[PDB]
Amino acid sequence: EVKKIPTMIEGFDDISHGGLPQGATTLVSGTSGTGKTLFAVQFLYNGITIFNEPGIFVTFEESPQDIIKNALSFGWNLQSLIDQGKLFILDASPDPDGQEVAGDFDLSALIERIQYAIRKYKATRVSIDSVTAVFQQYDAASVVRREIFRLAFRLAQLGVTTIMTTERVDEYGPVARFGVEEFVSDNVVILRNVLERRRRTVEILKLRGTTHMKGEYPFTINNGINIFDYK
């Protein structure tokens, strides 16, 4: 009764029985170097090149120019899509000259900027990477938490499908850092990278209100994410 949109990421629409819940937010959590950013880029890249659905990529730590070239490192040319006006990178990373805090605040400007970008470019897919970085660029975890919830609420109302990437502490422990799984709660995907040789896995921990293949499945990073051995 909930509908999903196809990610076209090789093997994911099968383990998830269709893809990502439309008009909702899916967390994609994992330690550093698990392919979260890669997942987030591939999601929008396919949306644009296969489905002609424009996308916004919101970045909280990496600069837009390091997103584009780290994407080159993954095998994709984002600047073309930006030049066609089908992809927009929203720079929500910190200013290197510093930002001094001198009282209490919220993240309203961030939310309005995103909503504005969505409507200006007519986007239906949004990627946000990586929301945990925010908690380290401001020391008020409770307002940061609230604003992340309120952002998810707004993204839903705008009828947009969203991926939020999140850092982990370890491959087996808390689902996401700073307890963001308490507000963005319904849809969680976990990515692990453990040891002979590295083994990478994807797990659909939760997809509230619908069916999905349960447990960990292996995948390789070869010009995209490639999940296998799941019948």
């Binding site: 000259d97 930002q99 009282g103 919220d106 309203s108 400007a109 309005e112």
Partner: protein
Amino acid sequence: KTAVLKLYVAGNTPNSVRALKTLNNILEKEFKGVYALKVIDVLKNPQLAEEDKILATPTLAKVLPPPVRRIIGDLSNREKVLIALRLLA
């Protein structure tokens, strides 16, 4: 001795109202020199917030005197504002 400032606010939330109040009284009473303070509602002018990469509200973006710097919050900690207007070391 010239100030060019932009204050990004979010509607008429108490934090924004406080910041405008604090900032106005500092400029008119403890500041000497010429100044122009632009107050922008991000709910009404989002593109302006995109241009300046504003994330939090309220945000105080000093254009002059140089160098360009950002101050976040309702501006309760006034010294951080004074140092920016150069009125205190």
